[PDB]
Write a protein that binds this ligand. Structure first.
Ligand code: COH
Ligand code: COH
Ligand SMILES: *[C@@H]1O[C@H](CO)[C@@H](O[C@@H]2O[C@H](CO)[C@@H](O[C@@H]3O[C@H](CO)[C@@H](O)[C@H](O)[C@@H]3O)[C@H](O)[C@H]2NC(C)=O)[C@H](O)[C@H]1NC(C)=O
Ligand SMILES: *[C@@H]1O[C@@H](CO)[C@@H](O[C@@H]2O[C@H](CO)[C@@H](O)[C@H](O)[C@H]2NC(C)=O)[C@H](O)[C@H]1NC(C)=O
Ligand SMILES: *[C@@H]1O[C@H](CO)[C@@H](O[C@@H]2O[C@H](CO)[C@@H](O)[C@H](O)[C@H]2NC(C)=O)[C@H](O)[C@H]1NC(C)=O
Ligand SMILES: *[C@@H]1O[C@H](CO)[C@@H](O[C@@H]2O[C@H](CO)[C@@H](O)[C@H](O)[C@H]2NC(C)=O)[C@H](O)[C@H]1NC(C)=O
Ligand SMILES: CCCCC/C=C\C/C=C\C/C=C\C/C=C\CCCC(=O)OC[C@@H](O)CO
Ligand SMILES: CCCCC/C=C\C/C=C\C/C=C\C/C=C\CCCC(=O)OC[C@@H](O)CO
Ligand SMILES: CCCCCCCCO[C@@H]1O[C@H](CO)[C@@H](O)[C@H](O)[C@H]1O
Ligand SMILES: *[C@@H]1O[C@H](CO)[C@@H](O)[C@H](O)[C@H]1NC(C)=O
Ligand SMILES: *[C@@H]1O[C@H](CO)[C@@H](O)[C@H](O)[C@H]1NC(C)=O
Lengths: 552, 551
C-alpha cells in the first residue's frame, strides 16, 4: 500500500512516495525539519511558545466589553484589530488551490479543472489498509448508527447565542451560490464555477439563464406583481428551469437564479428580497445616470449587490456567529499593504462543515400558524398568504437550533445528515484530528475531550475505538461548544479561513476594483459601505419591519 | 456621444459619464488629483523627479558589459536586480483583470467570462465621433495604404540582434498556446481558457483531447516511429482533430495538442521536440518512482515541462530579446516577500503586439534547399525528409527579420498584417499615444519622433494627420528601434509587463507549488531549474546539435 497512508508528515509537510514502502517529507517553508517535519527551527520554537490558543483568543474577544467598546469607536484601533483578524486566518488556505477528490498530489488537472471542489487535505489513498489510513478498524462504524446515537434530535436544543430563522435561512440562501454539488458527477464536483460570491443564486450560473431572468429594461430583473406585491417571475414566463414537484401551480413556480430555491419558502423569501434589492439599485443608478443603457445598469447593480452581500456577511452574519464584542469590519483597504491572493476555490471540507441542519426547528412558525416540514417544503403559497412582512417578523422571533453539542439533527433531514457522513467517506476524507492539525489545532486525546461529556463520548468510543479515526462531520455536530455558543472550536477554526478567502478574495475587493467608479460613483459605493441585514429588509419589505440575526 | 470619448482622465484615472455630456474622473490611488487626475501629489512629484526613463534604464542594461559580468557572478546582487525587474513591471497590469472588447466599464461578465481576451485599455465607445475618440478624421486611413506604404518588405532587413529561425519558430510555437483567437466569436475572444503557460499546445485544451493524445502507459504521450525517429501520432490513429488542407496524406497528418501546428513545419519541429521531452521526463520520473502509476507520471511530467518552458522563456528567450548584459533569472522565490497575484488573463493588446510577422524570412533555408512560403506551408514532408537535426542546424544558422524600423513584413503574409490592423479597429483599440500613456511612456509629439526618420513619417502624416490617432500595431512595426535592436521602446514596455504576468503568475510559481515534491522530488525539480533551449534540443534531437536564439 501507499507509504503515505499513515499521514506521517507533520506541520503542513508534504508526503511523497520514494519507493513501494518508502516515503519522504518535503518540509519546505513549514518552519520544521527532520524526517517528518517535527523538529522546529529556532524562530519557530519561539513562535509556538508565544502564540495563544484559539480558545484563549476567543475568550478575549468575548469578554472585556468595556475595552472593546473603546476599541470599536476608535477607527484606527478597530482597523488594526480587523487587519490582524484577516491576516491571521489568510495563511491557512492553499491559494492557488492544490488537491481534490481525485488528486492527492498537485497537478495541472486539479489546478485548472473548475468543476471540482478543492481539498484542504488530500484524500486517503485508494489502497490504504484502513479508511483513515492505517489506524482504526477495517470499516468505519455504520453511518446510520453514528447518526442515531449521537446526531439525531431527541428534544429541540435552542441555540444559546439566539440565532433565529432569519439567520438560518440567510445561511442557506447565501451558501447555496457556492455549494452546488453536481450529483451527476459526484460529491467532489461543483456546479458553481465562480467558486465564491458571484450571486449566481440570483442571476443564474450561465449567461443563458441570466438573460432569461432579465427584463432588458433599466438593468432590471423580470418580476410579477401578485396582490400588489413584487415576486420573482414564473417558470412558464421565463423558461428558466427550476426544481418543482409536478403538482405545484404555474403561478407559484417562481423562477430565480438558483434552481433549488423553490424547495423552501424561507429561501424564496430571500430570493424575493434580493430581486427587489437589485431593481431598487437599478432605480437609484438610473437616477444618477440617465445616460446609461440597460446593460451597464444591470452589471453595475450586480457589482453593488455582491458588495452589499459581503458587507452584510461580515458585519452582521459572521459578527453574530462569532459572539465577539469587537465589531468586525468590511474594508478591502485593510489588505492593500498585505500579501493576499484575490482568488478563491471552494473547498469540499468547507461544504461539509457547513451542513448546519441542527439549525432547523421542529416546526416553522409564521404568524399564528405552525407548519411541519411536510407542509413547509415546496409551498410558496405560505409566502404569498402571509407576505414578506410577516415572514420577517416571525422568522426574526423564532429561535434556531444549536449546531454543536450533539443530538440536534431533526429527523426530517436524517437522510441528509447520513449523506454527509457517507459522502465524506466516499471522498476519502482524512480524520477529524488530521483536519485539526491542518488548521493548527491540538488533536483530541479522547472522545470525552471532544464532547466535554460522558454519554455520547462512550457511544462514539464503542463505535470508532480510536479518537484518531473519529470523522470530521459528526465530530463538528457533537463537539463541546464554546461557552453558551452555537459552535465548538473546530467549526470556527476551519470555517473562518475558508470564509475569509471567499469574501475578501472576490475581485471587487482588489485595489483596481475597490473604487467609486466601479459602482457608478459615490452613490453606488455608499450602498455597499452602509449595507446591513436591517437596511436590506427595510428598503425591500413593506412596513420596514425590524430584523436581525438574533431573537434577543 | 459618450462624454469619455476624448479619454480625458490621465494617469490611470477612470472616466465615468455623469450625464449625457458630463464626465467625472475617479483618481483613486493614481497619486494624482484634480478634474483630469493631472495635479500630482507631493510624494508623486518626487517619485517622478527620481524616476529614470525606460530608454535610460535600457542604456544601462545594454552597456557597461564588464560591470554586468561582475554583477552576474554575485548571486545576491543578481537576485536583487532581478527582483527589481519583476516588481517594476508588475504594477502595470490589472490583476484581477478588468475590461474587455464588450465592456468599457468593470463588470462581472468581463471578470468571469474566460472566453474573452482582457483589455489593458477599454474600447472606444460605439458612438464616438471618430475611431480614436474625438481626434483625427471621421475614418482612419485605408489599412491597405498603411500596409503598402510603411509595412511591406522591399529589401529584407535582417535583425541586428541576430535573432534566428529557432527564435522565430519558438516565438510562434510558445505564444500560440495562449493566443488562440476564436474566429467564430470574434477577434476579442480566445479558445485558450487557461490564459497562460499551461502547455495546451502539447497536451490539448480539453480533457477529451488530452486523453486521445496520451498512451496511458508510463505517463507518456502517443507517438510513432518513422525511420528510427520519434514523431507525433496521426489524426487517423488518435481521432484528434487537426487543421489540414484536404490534400494532405493521412500519414502526414500529425496530431498534436494545438490544432493549427500542422500549418508550419517549424511548429511541427517544436511539437516533436516537446513531445520527446515529455516522454524523456516520464522515463526519468519512473526511475525515481517505480511505484507511481501512469496518471501521476503524466501529471508530474506536465508540471515539469511547464517549469522548463517558463525557465527557457525567461533565461534564453527574453534574455536574447532584451539585449541585456545582465543575466535574467527564473526564480519564484524572488516574489515570496512581494505583493503579487498568481493569476493571469491574456490581454488582446498582448496578442496584437506579438504579431511579429516581420521576423519571417523570404524563403526557409534547410540544408541545401530554399523553400518559398508556398512550398513550406502545410508541408511536413520537409520535416521527415531533412529530419530534426538538420532543422535545428539550419534554423540556428538562418537570420530572422527586424520587427521595428518599418517596411519588413514579407509580401507572402500581407493579408495577415492587414488583418492585425483591421481587427484592431473592429475591436475599437485606442490610439498608440493612449497606450504609451497607459504604460508610463511619453506620448510621441510627431511622426518623425516615432520613426526616427523622415520618409515613412511623412507618409504616415499624410495618412493619419495627427500623431494622436496613429494606431498601435502599425506604430510598433515602424517605430525607431533601439540602437542595433529588434524592437522600439513601445514594444518592450508593453510586452514585458504582459510577459512577466503570464510567466510568474503561473500557479507553479506560487509558494505552495514551488517545492521539490510538486515535481516528484529534487531530480524532477532540477530538470526545471537547469532547463535551457540548448538542453531541450540536446536531450531530444539526434546528435545533440548546437543551438541558441541568435546567429
Ligand atoms: C446552512 C445551513 C442549512 C440549512 C438551514 C439547510 C436547510 C435545509 C432544509 C430546510 C430548510 C432542507 C429540507 C434541506 C435539505 C437538504 N440540504 Co440543506 N441546509 C443547510 C446547509 C446545506 C449545505 C451547505 C448543503 C450542501 C449543498 C451542496 O453541496 O450542493 C445542503 C444540502 C442539502 C440537500 C442535498 C443537496 C442538494 O443539492 O440539495 C438536501 C436534500 N444543505 N436543508
Ligand atoms: C510570434 C511570432 C510569429 C511568427 C514567427 C508567425 C509565423 C507565421 C507564418 C509562417 C511560419 C505564417 C504563414 C503565419 C500566418 C498567420 N499568423 Co502568425 N506568426 C507569429 C505570430 C502570430 C500571432 C501572435 C497570431 C495571432 C494568433 C491568434 O490570435 O490565434 C498570428 C496569426 C496568424 C494568422 C491568422 C490571421 C489572423 O486573423 O490573426 C495567420 C494566417 N501570428 N504566421
Ligand atoms: C474536469 O474533470 C471531470 C472529471 O474527470 C471531467 O469529466 C470527465 O470527462 C471525460 C472525458 O471528457 C469523460 O470520460 C468519458 O469518455 C468517453 C467518451 O469518449 C466515454 O466512455 C464516457 O462515457 C465519458 O464520456 C468522463 O465521463 C467525465 N467524468 C465525469 C463526468 O466525472 C471534465 O471533463 C473536466 N473538465 C474539463 C473542463 O476538463
Ligand atoms: C517519523 O515517522 C514515523 C512513521 O509514522 C515513525 O515511524 C514509526 O515509529 C514508531 C515508534 O513510535 C513505530 O512504532 C512504527 O513502527 C514506525 N512506523 C513505521 C512504518 O516506520 C518514525 O520513527 C518518525 N521518525 C522520526 C525521526 O521522528
Ligand atoms: C461568454 O461570452 C460569450 C459572448 O457573450 C457567450 O457566448 C454567447 O452565449 C449566448 C447565450 O448562451 C449565445 O446565444 C451566443 O451565441 C454566444 N455569443 C457569441 C458566440 O459571441 C458565452 O456564453 C459566455 N460564457 C459563459 C460561460 O457565460
Ligand atoms: C480637463 O480636461 C478637459 C477636457 O480635455 C479640459 O477642457 C478642455 O480644455 C481645453 C483648453 O483648456 C478647451 O479648448 C476645451 O474647452 C476643453 N476640451 C474639450 C474636449 O471640450 C480641461 O481644461 C481640463 N481641466 C483642467 C482642470 O485642467
Ligand atoms: C464565504 C463566507 C462563508 C460564510 C461565513 C460564515 C461562517 C463560516 C463558517 C463557519 C465558521 C464559524 C463561525 C464564523 C464566525 C465567527 C468566527 C470568527 C470570524 C473571524 O475570525 O473572522 C472572520 C473573517 O474571516 C471574515 O472575513
Ligand atoms: C502570457 C504569457 C507571457 C509569457 C511571455 C512570452 C512572451 C513575452 C516575451 C516578450 C514580450 C515582448 C517584449 C519584451 C521582451 C524583452 C524586453 C525585456 C524584458 C524585461 O526587461 O523584463 C523581463 C521580465 O519581464 C521577465 O519576466
Ligand atoms: C431520534 C431519537 C433517536 C432514536 C434512535 C435510537 C438509537 C439508539 O441511541 C440511543 O438512544 C438513547 C436515547 O436517547 C440514548 O440514551 C443512548 O445513549 C443512545 O445510544
Ligand atoms: C401549503 O400551505 C398552505 C397555506 O398557505 C396550507 O394550507 C396547505 O395545506 C399546504 N399544502 C401542502 C401540500 O402541504
Ligand atoms: C513539399 O516539400 C517537398 C520536399 O520534401 C517538395 O518536393 C514539394 O514540392 C513540396 N510540396 C508542395 C506541394 O509544395
Amino acid at each position: 500500500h501507499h507509504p503515505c497512508c499513515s499521514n506521517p508528515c507533520q506541520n503542513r509537510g508534504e508526503c511523497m512516495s520514494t519507493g513501494f514502502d518508502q516515503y519522504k517529507c518535503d518540509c519546505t517553508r513549514t518552519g520544521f525539519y527532520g524526517e517528518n517535519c517535527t523538529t522546529p527551527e529556532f524562530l519557530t520554537r519561539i513562535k509556538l511558545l508565544l502564540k495563544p490558543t484559539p480558545n484563549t483568543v476567543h475568550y478575549i474577544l468575548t469578554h472585556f466589553k468595556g475595552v472593546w467598546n473603546i476599541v470599536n469607536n476608535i477607527p484606527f484601533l478597530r482597523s488594526l484589530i480587523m487587519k490582524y483578524v484577516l491576516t491571521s486566518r489568510s495563511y491557512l488556505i492553499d491559494s492557488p488551490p492544490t488537491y481534490n477528490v481525485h488528486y492527492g498530489y498537485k497537478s495541472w488537472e486539479a489546478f485548472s479543472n473548475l468543476s471540482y471542489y478543492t481539498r484542504a487535505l488530500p484524500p486517503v489513498a485508494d489502497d490504504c489498509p484502513t479508511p483513515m489510513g492505517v489506524k482504526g478498524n477495517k470499516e468505519l462504524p455504520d453511518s446510520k448508527e453514528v447518526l442515531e446515537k449521537v446526531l439525531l434530535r431527541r428534544e429541540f436544543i435552542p441555540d444559546p447565542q439566539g440565532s433565529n430563522m432569519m439567520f438560518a435561512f440567510f445561511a442557506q440562501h447565501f451558501t447555496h451560490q457556492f455549494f452546488k454539488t453536481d450529483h451527476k458527477r459526484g460529491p467532489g464536483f461543483t456546479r458553481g464555477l465562480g467558486h465564491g460570491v458571484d450571486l449566481n443564486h440570483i442571476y443564474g450560473e450561465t449567461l443563458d439563464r441570466q438573460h432569461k431572468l432579465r427584463l432588458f429594461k433599466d438593468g432590471k430583473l423580470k418580476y410579477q406583481v401578485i396582490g400588489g406585491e413584487v415576486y420573482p417571475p414564473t417558470v412558464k414566463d421565463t423558461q428558466v428551469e427550476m426544481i418543482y414537484p409536478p403538482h405545484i401551480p404555474e403561478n407559484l413556480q417562481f423562477a430565480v437564479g438558483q434552481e433549488v430555491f423553490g424547495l423552501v419558502p424561507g429561501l424564496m423569501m430571500y430570493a424575493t428580497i434580493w430581486l427587489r434589492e437589485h431593481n431598487r439599485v437599478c432605480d437609484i443608478l438610473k437616477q444618477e445616470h440617465p445616460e446609461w443603457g440597460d446593460e451597464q445598469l444591470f452589471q453595475t447593480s450586480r457589482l453593488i449587490l455582491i458588495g452589499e452581500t459581503i458587507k452584510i456577511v461580515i458585519e452582521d452574519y459572521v459578527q453574530h456567529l462569532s459572539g465577539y464584542h469587537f465589531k468586525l469590519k468590511f474594508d478591502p483597504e485593510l489588505l492593500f499593504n498585505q500579501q493576499f491572493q484575490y482568488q478563491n476555490r471552494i473547498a469540499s471540507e468547507f461544504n461539509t462543515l457547513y451542513h448546519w441542519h441542527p439549525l432547523l426547528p421542529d416546526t416553522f412558525n409564521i404568524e399564528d400558524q405552525e407548519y411541519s416540514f411536510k407542509q413547509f417544503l415546496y409551498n410558496n403559497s405560505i409566502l404569498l398568504e402571509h407576505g414578506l412582512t410577516q415572514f420577517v417578523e416571525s422568522f426574526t422571533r423564532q429561535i434556531a437550533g444549536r449546531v454543536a453539542g450533539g443530538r440536534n439533527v431533526p429527523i426530517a433531514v436524517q437522510a441528509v445528515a447520513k449523506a454527509s457522513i457517507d459522502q465524506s467517506r466516499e471522498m476519502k476524507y482524512q480524520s477529524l484530528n488530521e483536519y485539526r492539525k491542518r488548521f493548527s489545532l491540538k488533536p483530541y486525546t479522547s472522545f470525552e475531550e471532544l464532547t466535554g461529556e460522558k454519554e455520547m463520548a462512550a457511544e462514539l468510543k464503542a463505535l470508532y475505538s480510536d479518537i484518531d479515526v473519529m470523522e470530521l462531520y459528526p465530530a463538528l455536530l457533537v463537539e463541546k461548544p464554546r461557552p453558551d455558543a452555537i459552535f465548538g472550536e473546530t467549526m470556527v477554526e476551519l470555517g473562518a479561513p475558508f470564509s475569509l478567502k471567499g469574501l475578501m478574495g472576490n475581485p471587487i475587493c482588489s485595489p483596481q476594483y475597490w473604487k467609486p467608479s466601479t459602482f457608478g460613483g459615490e452613490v453606488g459605493f455608499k450602498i455597499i459601505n452602509t449595507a446591513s441585514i436591517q437596511s436590506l429588509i427595510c428598503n425591500n419589505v413593506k412596513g420596514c419591519p425590524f430584523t436581525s440575526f438574533n431573537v434577543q
